[PDB]
């Protein structure tokens, strides 16, 4: 239930091995399971060589806070998982980006958090790990092998990312105005003006529910409703081979567009299946990814389908009279 989506925890032995680009959706999901995306991020941004998630995979990733509702659902994507799928971009942190207090950053190699206008990740170089405060990377002899466990990866917030239905700019302005009405005291969130203020305090940790609706910044909400609907779309199913691994792009395409590959009850319901009469040695099987579905948020008197939805810790500034 909380285990891997399609692929068990990776067992790497060659930290210099290249990370291939896989076109198939199931192949990308398998890479996400093994934390290949986080390793690629660290290689691209942090002068790091090797892998994270050794023997544990994405299912063993550390979370802040430790109790995570959406981590139980292995099918709910995180900001890094959505980044690997082209859904968003986890930008490398700059000096202006704020590190939220509360997580245990000691020994972490990568950690990302959603900021008011995006998603920001911090990484460390080869043979280095974060200090207790997370401000600096220092030499760590336990990371010298380059094949690191999943607890070196920290994801901040209870976040689920999904395909969105774009909303007009006027709707976003209405949502933003309602959010400003709900948070009169807030002035700056992550260094971004929320309300116009004349005199503000220092940044403070700020645990808040938010939805990213594909606009300039996020819609932070205090009173809202959420409902999860299973739409049985193609992205909700992953095709594997039961021992070989994820199916190739062509195999997955044939399975999802021909109704001949076998699958679970939901896949047979939505796309059809042909059990028996084994044409191949062992056909691909497509199964529903374990998630509560797509989230629809009723906020400010309107229902939207956000790009991402979560409850996370940001840094906010309060008005000073």
């Amino acid at each position: 239930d909380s285990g891997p989506i399609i692929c068990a925890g990776p067992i790497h032995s060659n930290k210099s091995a290249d990370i291939p680009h896989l076109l198939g959706y199931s192949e990308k999901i398998c890479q996400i399971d093994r934390l290949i995306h986080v390793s690629s991020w660290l290689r691209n941004h942090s002068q790091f060589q090797g892998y994270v998630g050794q023997r544990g995979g994405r299912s063993q990733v550390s979370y802040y806070p430790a109790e995570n509702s959406y981590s139980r659902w292995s099918g709910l994507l995180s900001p890094c998982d959505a980044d690997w799928l082209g859904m968003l971009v986890v930008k490398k942190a700059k000096g202006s980006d704020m590190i939220v207090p509360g997580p245990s950053y000691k020994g972490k190699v990568f950690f990302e958090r959603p900021t008011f206008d995006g998603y920001v990740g911090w990484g460390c170089g080869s043979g280095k790990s974060r200090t207790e405060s997370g401000e600096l990377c220092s030499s760590d002899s336990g990371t010298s092998s380059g094949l690191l466990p999943s607890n070196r990866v920290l994801w901040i917030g209870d976040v689920a990312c999904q395909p969105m239905t774009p909303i007009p700019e006027e709707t976003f302005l209405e949502l933003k105005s309602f959010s400003q009405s709900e948070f009169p005291d807030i002035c700056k969130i992550d260094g971004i003006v929320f309300n116009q203020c004349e005199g503000e305090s220092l940044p403070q940790p700020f645990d808040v529910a938010w939805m990213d609706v594909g606009h300039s910044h996020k819609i932070i909400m205090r009173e809202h409703k959420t409902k999860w609907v299973q739409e049985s779309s193609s992205k909700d199913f992953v095709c594997y081979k039961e021992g070989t691994g994820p199916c190739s792009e062509s195999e997955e395409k044939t399975c999802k567009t021909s109704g001949s590959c076998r699958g679970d009850m939901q896949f047979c319901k939505v796309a059809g299946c042909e059990h028996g009469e084994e044409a191949s040695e062992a056909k691909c099987r497509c199964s529903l990814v374990h998630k509560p579905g797509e989230v629809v948020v009723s906020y400010g008197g309107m229902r939207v389908r956000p790009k991402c939805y979560g409850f996370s810790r940001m840094m906010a500034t309060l008005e000073v009279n």
Partner: antibody
Amino acid sequence: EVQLVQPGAEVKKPGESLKISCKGSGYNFSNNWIGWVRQMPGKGLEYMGIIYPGDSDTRYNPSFKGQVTMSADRSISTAYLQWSSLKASDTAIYYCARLYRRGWTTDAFDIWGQGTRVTASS
Amino acid sequence: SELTQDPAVSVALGQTVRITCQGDTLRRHYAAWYQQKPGQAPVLVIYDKNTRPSGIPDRFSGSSSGNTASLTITGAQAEDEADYYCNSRDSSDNLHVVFGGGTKLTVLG
């Protein structure tokens, strides 16, 4: 090979509970939706809904939401259309069909039943 | 969607007929075309872009033009006088289907 069989005819009292059946043979009956359509005498074809007998799931036409109930019996490979109130307008030919799906783009009722004529004879 | 159809199509002699049904869901989903002679059960004649079940005459063809789908009958003889229905995937619900109203046909004799 694959076929759906229905009773030839089924006469009943108006206002009486009634239940028609469609039994599938030649394939795993629980792997395909079974859809029901109606044809009034001398009128067009109107589609009620589809029942998946794998878990007896249903998807109705908005027109047919409380008028009829679709049930499934996976063990004997049967689908059922029941009324509990025959009324008088329900005198029509009822067809069961097997919905064959190819991905997210194709829905076809390749196999069709022969039809049950239900008459509120009076 | 709703898959609107013309209630009747004029007698196209022995010429080519272009029975058409239009709807929103036809933008992304193919339309399956069934034919029903009067007194017989409906018979699926087209079920993909152009895929045709065995036994159906080759004159039946399927085409999609965006928001509309067409069943084309090249040689319209006395056999084709029937009611033609189009059905497709429901746009709102991936597990649901939507049926057309049905189109008549006429030929000579």
